[PDB]
Design a binder for this molecule. Structure first.
Ligand SMILES: NC(=O)C1=CN([C@@H]2O[C@H](COP(=O)(O)OP(=O)(O)OC[C@H]3O[C@@H](n4cnc5c(N)ncnc54)[C@H](O)[C@@H]3O)[C@@H](O)[C@H]2O)C=CC1
Length: 405
């Protein structure tokens, strides 16, 4: 009986985390992003050999889809995901990458992936090995890792990032998605150890190590390009992402890229940049209580303006407008910007006006909490059109050309 090896997969939410994922819905969600890109049309003069570090979910997945199905690129992806097994759904990123390989092959595009710790030297060497064997060199490197922790590749020290202000404690309003209550909490200021640890995790060092390992091995093409994704946001989150521990990481990202840019400028006129994207629902969003509230408000306001977007819309524009086109958004430090619709003065004024009016009773009248919840479940393959959620599936979905680290 195949029933022993198959199961009906439903969302299981534990501690603001969805701990299941649906393979059919994840495939459909990837196909929806592919179909957005092909519907919008191809992107000319893009890279044709692309390495995406953090390629399995969110903005890195969107870059992989944009490069492959927008620019026609062969893509090598690096990620850290859990395969499925009987009775135990794997992570959404695993099923997303299975669907990506499936659809890439259908269109005669190369798709190989590496599963393991991208902060390690071992994974960097496996990645170099793949490029040498298959592509020769890569034209473009997307750096799109998000992790709460980094094991230093030389010392073994485990660094943990912190989400805290610097200087004074701050009161941050938020939304508890389990209890569905508006809830303020006070974050204490970060110690210097927390600051240094957060720079080590979310700063630019590992990005630099990647480029330095790749340039040394000759697998970066002439005219190569690399970008790292980040968020800056506006006043509502600024205590954390401007002036807080994470802001220190974005500073160190701004300064480490100067070094990376110098390394690649001497390797035949290459370049390195920081790309700033808009806030989206991601799998970590519910665990940071301010983000569900901010997103629920932002979604409603931007939907009223016709400007609401998610990952694939954002990254397709980044590629078309800035990474490959002639109408870029450079900011004063020399960053590429895709977040300009989120930072519209009137949107921000409206969100900030609503931020102070939302209460437990008008949540659904003042916010798009409905949309937040739907987009959150969608990440894990739940609530997707065309999917029969009553049908058994085998959670052990396999991936060809998956190198396990
Ligand atoms: N979520 C958001 O609202 C925004 C995110 N960003 C940036 O986009 C990038 C991706 O963030 P998200 O899409 O939010 O997160 P995500 O959680 O969707 O994806 C993170 C990626 O990193 C991979 N990863 C994590 N730890 C790894 C490790 N040790 N080794 C290898 N792969 C590992 C995951 O497998 C996945 O591919 C980040 O640089 C983030 O700062 C920028 C603007 C807003």
């Amino acid at each position: 009986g195949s029933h022993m090896l198959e199961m009906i997969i439903k969302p299981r939410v534990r501690g603001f985390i969805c701990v299941t994922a649906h393979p059919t819905g994840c495939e459909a969600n990837v196909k929806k992003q592919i179909d957005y890109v092909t519907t919008e049309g191809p992107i000319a003069n893009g890279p044709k050999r692309v390495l995406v570090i953090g390629a399995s979910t969110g903005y890195g997945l969107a870059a992989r889809i944009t490069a492959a199905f927008g620019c026609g690129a062969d893509t090598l992806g690096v990620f850290f995901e859990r395969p499925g097994e009987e009775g135990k759904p794997g992570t959404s990123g695993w099923y997303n990458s299975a669907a990506f390989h499936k659809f890439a092959a259908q269109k005669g595009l190369y798709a190989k992936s590496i599963n393991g710790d991208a902060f390690s030297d071992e994974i960097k060497q496996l990645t170099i090995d793949a490029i040498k064997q298959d592509l020769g060199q890569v034209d473009q490197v997307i750096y799109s890792l998000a992790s709460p922790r980094r094991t230093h590749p030389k010392t073994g020290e485990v660094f943990n990032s912190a989400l805290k202000p610097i200087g004074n404690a701050v009161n941050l309003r938020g939304l508890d998605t389990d209890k569905e209550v508006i809830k303020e909490s006070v974050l204490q200021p970060a110690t210097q150890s927390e600051i240094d640890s957060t720079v080590a995790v979310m700063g630019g060092e590992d990005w630099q190590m990647w480029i330095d390992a790749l340039l040394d091995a000759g697998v970066l093409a002439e005219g190569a390009q690399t970008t790292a994704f980040t968020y800056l946001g506006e006043k509502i989150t600024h205590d954390i992402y401007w002036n807080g521990s994470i802001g220190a990481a974005k500073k160190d990202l701004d300064q480490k890229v100067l070094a990376i840019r110098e390394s690649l400028a001497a390797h035949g006129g290459g370049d390195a940049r920081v790309s700033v994207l808009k806030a989206v629902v991601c799998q970590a969003s519910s665990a940071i209580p301010m983000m569900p509230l901010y997103l629920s408000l932002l979604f409603k306001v931007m939907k009223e303006k016709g400007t609401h977007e998610g990952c694939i819309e954002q990254v397709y524009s980044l590629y078309k407008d800035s990474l490959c086109g002639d109408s870029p958004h450079m900011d004063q430090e020399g960053r590429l910007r895709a977040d300009y619709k989120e930072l519209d003065p009137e949107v921000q004024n409206q969100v900030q006006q609503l931020w102070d009016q939302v209460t437990n009773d008008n949540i659904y009248q003042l916010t798009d909490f409905v949309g937040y919840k739907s987009e959150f479940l969608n990440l894990f393959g739940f609530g997707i059109d065309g999917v029969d959620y009553d049908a058994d599936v085998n959670p052990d979905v396999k991936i060809p050309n998956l190198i396990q680290g």
